[model samples]
Target: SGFRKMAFPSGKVEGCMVQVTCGTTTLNGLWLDDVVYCPRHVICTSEDMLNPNYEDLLIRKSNHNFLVQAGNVQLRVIGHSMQNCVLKLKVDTANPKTPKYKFVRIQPGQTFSVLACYNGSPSGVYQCAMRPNFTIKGSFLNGSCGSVGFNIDYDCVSFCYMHHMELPTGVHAGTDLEGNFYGPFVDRQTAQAAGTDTTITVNVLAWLYAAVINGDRWFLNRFTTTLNDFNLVAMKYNYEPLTQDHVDILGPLSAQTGIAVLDMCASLKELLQNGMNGRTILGSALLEDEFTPFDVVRQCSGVTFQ
Candidate 1:
């Protein structure tokens, strides 16, 4: 009955959100109904006033949650908690308040991927999953958070715009000017000048030195981390736990200016095409990192009365 574009959030829903009712405390991801929407607060409230601290505004976000880690077609409902609960899931409907469901079961996580989704651009026609997201209900048997109702979006962006994720390009081949002829040219030239073997170990070593010193940077420079890449690919392509840390770094600015999509493109040009803003440089031997702007309502942000 209810219908929505597979790529967008619920209508009038504005932004989607997440939270966990743990013991006496509830932890929240950055975004919430009360907290300023990411695309707005960053650009208007904080930046225009030349203020900061909301830079870490989205630091609290996470994909992990109670029984439903995710509900997208790519990721089915997951029961990550330690509770053996009766889980019931419903598809989006004509009346959101009342949903529909043609399937029901329980699993430990989305790894099994039990539900079946439409192959192409889906419609809200079927009484089952034809669109993105689902309404979930479950009651725990053990002494836990009790009964829970949650909404899962095919795309996390439906709730928290920054929690979006998609595919990405991985690794690359080299073609930079520095890669081919920058290093060891002198040594090779000398070897060629002399009657020595052109295949001298030192000649090869010189080229190797340049490849490590200069060529690597050129290869990595091609690593694009723009908003388009971020919103679409960063968090998901790898399918890692709670992802998309790099692009989220600038998430605040995108939201603050209100031109999130537009300003982000301009900023990319300013940094790359025009080189006006600054250079995108790499630092540290960082092995692994990520950006998560979740919408969980934590005890720190969303507190209740006793």
Candidate 2:
């Protein structure tokens, strides 16, 4: 059946109230803002939807009709202070676009109810649009309203998962190249079991080097050889370490690999330091107090360390 519309009464006693009703059999999905009272105002004002008090002012459920108490209420159509008035309803038909529809109009001092029914074909999101009548005594913008969209399979999930069967494990998400930490010390795990004080000496040396480069004194304040502490040292050196080159190589590779560049760099550094470099070991420790962080080593060709 076609939709129906209604209006409000102009004059009423102080204690007397009016009942606004929808003619449809059932209203499975209906949303409305708080009713307003406008003696001579045009549009209704509603609170922001993000506000905590919005829940107390909203109307939910499928029943289309609403019972409003009329007391100090001035002449108003729905209520007077209407803002962001939206009505969303659901349809039960297989083809949601072809479902039966209706519209309602509210006038000054008028009260009415709305009723609608569904065919029970599931539910979806709907919207409504409304505006206040500025020319009349009680007129304003009610905003827009409507029913929910169709409950079809296409609109079910927000995102789809990509199928990746051939990519290696731990290689599906991020980039190709990785970063590492270069130092003159042995592994802490091996040093701990030997009961040698050499481990702490190596740690102190590393911390001093880091402090000199990063200009941060905290690096050596409470240094330790524990795994957690080592991890922190590794991360700091890997990312915000002695220089930016150590960090920059991972950025481009990260974009290509989708994995974090720092992580990649760490992996690569570990592989190289752990006897992974073939034949000759490339170890060069040169300190030039005369040069800045961007200084280039004379012996190395195309290899720049900052």
Candidate 3:
């Protein structure tokens, strides 16, 4: 064994020394820049380039949990260094100064994260180039730690779906109410003589209006029943025996259709299929019904929502 351990000022002995004979001169032993090598070994292993930076440095996509809303997707890249090396990560468009899409040792654990909203599209791919910690090169040593390429894949729900879609849940044991119901309980006993009201329908109607206005056209086309379901209930339950609160709730232009119950449903379905116009009032087909669309429209037009 021609190797011998070299001691350092910090009371640590790590670097080594090896003795070898290169041609005429009998070189006893040699060490260079914290590395132990022999002239004979260097010549014989000339093609075996020694890379100091290639010491267990790696980069990979991590599934780190992040708190974010449905409309956004989160991505993370983590780098592991055996020597606890600092890393420099740069996106596709790299620049030398500020505003560059780059990260430099942001995480103590060597992690870089970014959030993107792909509400317009479903999925996409991206990439980031990285450079690991490295130092000056020796004679036969590869200088830089070089770089690691990271690939990212992201998927997200469509814009309209992300905002408007409510996944169906199991209904109650013996009730039509779906999932857990935590809404107001109308006091039927007190309402017999006194009066009571709730803004449940009003709140729903407001959100429905906004949903149509903000919903994507292509997404709305596929799931046209978003507004239709509410429309049906508002009009179907528009008859008498309903309280003033119920009547006011059913007064929106969308709830009015001057046609029989059978034809009214058909007209409403067809209307949504053609376009998402909530204000259009079709012609009256039957007038003998207790609550006609024309009658409700006349009353609703006069009544101020405020």
Candidate 4:
């Protein structure tokens, strides 16, 4: 029996490739650029090199808990331990500067709670940040911390103010003014009574829709012409007293029929020769309802239908 001898190379070589002759005419080629051989005997990086030593911390705030109104809200820092440990709470979707809500400091082994508040807006994401102190002495104690994420919806009752309108029963009666109903007459008047002569005016339709859908009374002043292009065309013809036939012809033609009708009524109010006065006459048909302001201090704000 014959035993094969193992070959070992020991020399300072600098080249793009390396060749090893195992036995007789057998040769192995190693591409230095593409091949990576790490010695198992050598320790590479730290065990927790890729991720942070401290576990990620999560915190949540909801409009139901904070009862935030108006702009953004803050989650005041209650307490924390572990010095030099960076703490951050981010509002994932809302603006950071004026976050709808936020979290507070997160420290290890320390039981701390934050005072959070919700913004007047709808639901959004919430996050918290914390870094551990890894001393040369030893790795920080290992443990997992649990967090909570919550979603909050504004109460429908809080947006009742947007629904109040003075008008006869018919289609397009609600703020959306869908059917041939005269629901938007009130808002038209309100806008006119304000004595505003702006080319474009803010109507309560958006607010009404948001109120009915989310109960937050969210609104904007922009007129979505594309959404209600047909209504605009009808208004141009000076159609007197919206009729069923008119609704049948124009209702299906608009992107959002009800909203478009409200927008059209607003446009007519603005175009009136008396401007504000004409709007007041149209407003006579509007309704009035309650408005509930969230109690931020009490931290009790949730939507309800009335």
In lDDT terms, how accurate is model 4? 0.21
Q: Lowest lDDT 10-mer window, candidate 2?
A: 172-181
Candidate 4, superposed: residue stretches over 4 Å from native? 1-273, 278-302
Q: State model 3's lDDT.
A: 0.21
Task: Output the TM-score of candidate 4.
Answer: 0.16
lDDT of each residue in 66-135, candidate 4, tens digit only: 1111132222222221112222211112222221222222221111111111111212222211111200
Point out the higher-scoring one by TM-score: 1 or 2: 2
Which lDDT values do the candidates have, in the order given?
0.21, 0.22, 0.21, 0.21
Q: What shift in Å separates residue 187 of candidate 4 from its native position after superposition? A: 37
lDDT of 3 by residue, 54-167 (tens): 232122212121111112321121211122222122122111121111112221111111111121121212111110111101111111011111111122110100010011
Question: What are the C-alpha RMSDs, in order, of all predicted structures?
Answer: 25.7, 28.5, 29.1, 31.1
* Preferred candidate (lDDT higher): 1 or 2: 2
- Output the better candidate (1/3) by TM-score: 1
**Residue-wise C-alpha lDDT for candidate 1, range 112-133, written one tens digit per residue:** 1111111111112111110111
The digit string of per-residue lDDT tens for model 2 on 206-302 reads 2223222334222122222333433455454332222344335324333433444334334333432453334221222321111111111111112
Clashing pairs in 3: none
Q: Compute each candidate's TM-score over C-alphas.
A: 0.15, 0.16, 0.14, 0.16
